[PDB]
Amino acid sequence: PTTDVIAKLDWSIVNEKCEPTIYHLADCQNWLPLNRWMGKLTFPQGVTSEVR
């Protein structure tokens, strides 16, 4: 951009139930959340076979 920018965050309290996310050692689980960053993929501008 031409100048510096600002991001305004607005912290509130909504009225949803706080549900816990607890990991445990059961071998079969229905949903194991991870939020694992598989990676940032850069592809340069051009014509070549880009594979990641």
Added chain:
Amino acid sequence: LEADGCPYLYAIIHDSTTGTISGDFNLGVKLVGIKDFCGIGSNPGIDGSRL
């Protein structure tokens, strides 16, 4: 990569990266979660990261 029998997730450019302005086509992949997860065995561990 020649002798590694676990699966990868490929991300392949189907055509070409384009634009009127210069800059790379960045793209962020994030494994959110595993559904119907099934974990087998008991890892002694390895010590390192990439494959």
Added chain:
Amino acid sequence: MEQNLFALSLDDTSSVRGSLLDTKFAQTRVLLSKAMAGGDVLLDEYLYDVVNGQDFRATVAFLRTHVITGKIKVTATTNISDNSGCCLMLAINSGVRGKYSTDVYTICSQDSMTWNPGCKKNFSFTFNPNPCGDSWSAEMISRSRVRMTVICVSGWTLSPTTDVIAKLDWSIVNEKCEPTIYHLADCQNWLPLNRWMGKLTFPQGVTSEVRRMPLSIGGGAGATQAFLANMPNSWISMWRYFRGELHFEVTKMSSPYIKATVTFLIAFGNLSDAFGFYESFPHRIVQFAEVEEKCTLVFSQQEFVTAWSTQVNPRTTLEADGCPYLYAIIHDSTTGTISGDFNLGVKLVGIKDFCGIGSNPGIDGSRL
């Protein structure tokens, strides 16, 4: 254990069928130069040479299946920033003869997609490579010399940073191959044409820009001391006079940034430029959004009193020419933040409720 080998299902003459993955048979890589011009062959090869050096799921099924009742879908996944745009046209023609013309006019007839990468992310279209039957094969199109041609009808309005690629994905869908056969009935319900009425350039500025395209379409389009010919345009010139509901398909070829509003109307040649009352005539306004690229003008039977001639003598001036024209007039002005002309492509798709009168001896020439 043993079995009788004669009675196995090895003489399976099924067509190719399944999902779009299992019917894909080739991918093709077209290179669009950073600085490409209009009337510029990007790709031009035989449709069977597409499949050379390929290893997709239906590649071997495609080559070896004796009959295929399905159409060929081709999809083109090319894109560019809204800032820019161009107009590509992929097009399939049943054959060739030496040293051929690759002007958009010549090609478009028969089976073609036209799209602007600037607006449309991808573009797909189905077609039948045997135009007079329900079926075809790989061996038919190799020996028949069916010819696929990609052409750039309008250059990049703003050039990209680097070269570009268009990936074509040739598949076989499961629609019935219906034939398109022209015949000499005087009254026909739908006479398709895909006649390139012409590319309309309007420069950026303030002036009264008016463009006439004559509806005496027959007898081809011009060249040097020469003229070009489609089949369907040569076919309509079989008759002397004709009429019908005309279905044009006007397309944007510039980028979304070059903006302009265009009135279309039927009217006669005598009307000058700097005649300021074009909206007295019945007309149709055409503004394009950023995303929209394609718009269909229809002109009913109430726009034409009588039939008009398919060909006219080349030396008739606009002053004494009693066939109708299709005017395309800039309603305001051609504008944009970036330099580049407002290109616009008109294509007579077909004539509905076609009525062909008489029997043309012929004229020999093109424009009026």
Added chain:
Amino acid sequence: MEQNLFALSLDDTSSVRGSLLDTKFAQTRVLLSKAMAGGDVLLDEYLYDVVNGQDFRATVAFLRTHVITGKIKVTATTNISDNSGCCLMLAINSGVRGKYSTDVYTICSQDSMTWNPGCKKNFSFTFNPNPCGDSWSAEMISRSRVRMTVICVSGWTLSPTTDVIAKLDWSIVNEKCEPTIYHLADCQNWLPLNRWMGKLTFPQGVTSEVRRMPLSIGGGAGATQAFLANMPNSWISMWRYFRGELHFEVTKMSSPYIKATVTFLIAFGNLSDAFGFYESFPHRIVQFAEVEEKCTLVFSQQEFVTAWSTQVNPRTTLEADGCPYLYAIIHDSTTGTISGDFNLGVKLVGIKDFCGIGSNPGIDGSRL
């Protein structure tokens, strides 16, 4: 026209399926020498290297389909005049270790077809290359090193004029892949083995030919100062004593021209050759027709009083060996117009109503 490309059917994870034409994925060309011997590797390659340099309908589908729920059918279209005959055995094993044995004994376990070209025009058989699951893939079997082996267990009884070829046609049928898993339950309903009881040569002539094969099967088969091992034969030797209905599968390996009638019976080692009253025992006669090549002896629970030991000490003589044998006795005489022995291959397919007693410490050796 445009379409949303994310929502197309390009993530089709279907198995390979269709007719036998559209599921064929490779053909293999085995050369059988004019003068080939018994115990002679004809082909021996990895099952994935079969598909290298191939271009059939399902070749690309086979390689790229992540999961395949169907079995692999292989059919072998080899033939020869009734005059001659041999015995080929194609066989699939889940892996290898350096400098391996290719004796028929070692191989047959797991998944195999055995046929005599002289009698059977062609021979087909299905199998699952992942023996402990419902599914597999091309990538599984390439990296797992699944190994296909064709072996000639008995040479040509009369040599052909020229060299021969066996064409194998590898397909994917649509049967469910059922797993074959061995486990340590003492009572089991069906314990498959595919244990090569041995090749029985009987020379042409008049003499009392008797061949004993011991049913103390465990602890492998012999070599030099060494012994060979299948898995299933090593598995049954986990137990000390065992019993059950034994299901043998006796096969002709010579030509139809060498004719002989064979009595099979259970009995103990003490019985000498030139003891002329073998048909006092309960027995089963086996004459083969020209076309028949395969016959299944079953020996019920009434043939055995108690269980018997899986292994016996190697130095026990026939005089003091209280486990049962399977005798194979020539009922008349081995005959034919052409010279050549009457070969005959016995293969313990499996034990029904298997009952395994105790816990074998082990013995170390093979034959009894």
